[PDB]
Design a protein around this ligand. Structure first.
Ligand SMILES: *[C@H](S)C(=O)c1cccc(C(=O)Nc2ccccc2)c1
Ligand SMILES: *[C@H](S)C(=O)c1cccc(C(=O)Nc2ccccc2)c1
Lengths: 302, 302
């Protein structure tokens, strides 16, 4: 028992992290087979970042302008290309530590592990969720771009995020491994800002099931609700709408606990309307929305 | 910016995890050089667990009774011995992935990363603190014993915890790598229970400094307090006493933010006396005490 924000073991990703330097800009890259992936911003100067034309900047570079270091070893760059907002640096050597992998794009409301890295060296690992507004609430300092987010299933690493920047509210934006941004953000200097966000309802319900599995029951009640009435309440509290697919996805947790999904929705309605009256759930005094139903099943199945 | 419960990258520990089976009991072991460390409970039957004499149980075993599997490869056991509550299984082969390492015992109030493992396979990584009452609030299911806790400094893994059991409140107990339990717990069946706990004051103050570094300032005030008056309040709220060494340890964070330690203590006093009035700090509606001053400096230095 217990319930923690748990990341995937990071070793398979650690052995892919490298340092990429262009000019005076140093950031992280992801070395898979004989390619190193990194943010294309690495080819920019500070002055370049207002309306940069990356095609022009890149045509003015050659392979020797890219310094790739894998721990102690220099990797010889033998080709370079752009793919959306990422750069692909073809190298001399295939990474002998390449895991089985996929590039997947995730949905808002899905979670993933982040391996924060600086100068190609892994620093820490933590769990993040893609917010409805396509930002992530990460923990990143200068030099962290190029750090990646991922999930692991069996022995296969599904990379879903490369870090690019910090928005003015301190939340983070980046792309998928194909270089396509999550959300309406760009890799140039603008007044871009996170849009309005909402709470991920299905995840909050998953976490209430985790709490019941772990012995927190005080918020349960004998009541039930309809999906429509619940969604009226959700809309009032800036929660996203609950669909029948969400209800279906919560099926196994409902069966394990014997608490119907619409009964748990009645509990959530009460918690939104009344607050917690000084109590906690799984060690939190707020409703947590960064655990998916899958995260709960993975951690609480025993 | 941002502030997350961040674990150390787990790869160096992943390459040390193995499966140990004795009879019908399977658990995890830690393979370093040519020794595998695991909980001595592996030699028990269910009936053995009321007043077991482990010296008797072990003298009735031979090397061939221990099955050690490192992923796909069987490791031949060539010696066995007890060291307090852990078993040391000498094996045929030295682990080629052994990191630089130390066995350190930590203090209550210190944090560490936990690599949760099942059947020798790493499952997840998360950050934990040793509570004042020598339990940890982990996330562990059946089969997780033998999982370890650790910190990493430079390239050296300091192992500080091996998991043994779950107490009736759902919190966890285990030993150091020398097999000595943290706290007054034993590896036999008793009505043992976690003792009274307290909040780790110095860590809460560290986390308030993290919040200020990250732009949460609403809880600051122009007031200050004496150490004695603050500690009267701490005692009232089941917080541990703040020492001058704690104040000294908070020195760098105080200097970085320009908020004197006893000023931040005045803020903490107000928060304990008034609550939060519906606000949050670093995304929490409660005062967080599982970040050390070191954890804050490591993550918030930028
Ligand atoms: C690095 S995180 C990166 O890819 C990037 C993309 C877009 C914009 C920036 C930026 O403006 N400033 C930097 C520079 C270096 C490191 C972090 C942020 C960066
Ligand atoms: C395994 S976590 C372990 O070392 C252990 C030590 C002391 C007591 C127990 C126990 O009673 N029951 C078990 C058995 C197997 C796995 C977890 C707990 C276990």
């Amino acid at each position: 028992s217990g319930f923690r924000k748990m990341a995937f073991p990071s070793g398979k990703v650690e052995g892919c992290m490298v340092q990429v330097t262009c000019g005076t800009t140093t950031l992280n890259g992801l070395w898979l087979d004989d390619v190193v992936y990194c943010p294309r911003h690495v080819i920019c100067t500070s002055e370049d970042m207002l309306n940069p034309n990356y095609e022009d900047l890149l045509i003015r570079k050659s392979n020797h302008n890219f310094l790739v270091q894998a721990g102690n070893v220099q990797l010889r760059v033998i080709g370079h290309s752009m793919q959306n907002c990422v750069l692909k640096l073809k190298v001399d050597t295939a990474n002998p530590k390449t895991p089985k992998y996929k590039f997947v794009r995730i949905q808002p409301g899905q979670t993933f592990s982040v391996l924060a890295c600086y100068n190609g060296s892994p620093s820490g690992v933590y769990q993040c969720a893609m917010r409805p507004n396509f930002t992530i609430k990460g923990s990143f300092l200068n030099g962290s771009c190029g750090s990646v987010g991922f999930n692991i299933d069996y022995d296969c690493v599904s990379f879903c995020y490369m870090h690019h920047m910090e928005l003015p509210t301190g939340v983070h934006a980046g792309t998928d491994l194909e270089g396509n941004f999550y959300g309406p953000f760009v890799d140039r200097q603008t007044a871009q800002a996170a849009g309005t966000d909402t709470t991920i309802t299905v995840n909050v319900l998953a976490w209430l099931y985790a709490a019941v599995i772990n012995g927190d029951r005080w918020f349960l009640n004998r009541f039930t609700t309809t999906l429509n009435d619940f969604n009226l309440v959700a809309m009032k509290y800036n929660y996203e709408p609950l669909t029948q697919d969400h209800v279906d996805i919560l099926g196994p947790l409902s069966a394990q606990t014997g608490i119907a999904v619409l009964d748990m929705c009645a509990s959530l309605k009460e918690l939104l309307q009344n607050g917690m009256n000084g109590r906690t759930i799984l060690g939190s005094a707020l409703l947590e929305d960064e655990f998916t139903p899958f995260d709960v099943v993975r951690q609480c199945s025993g």
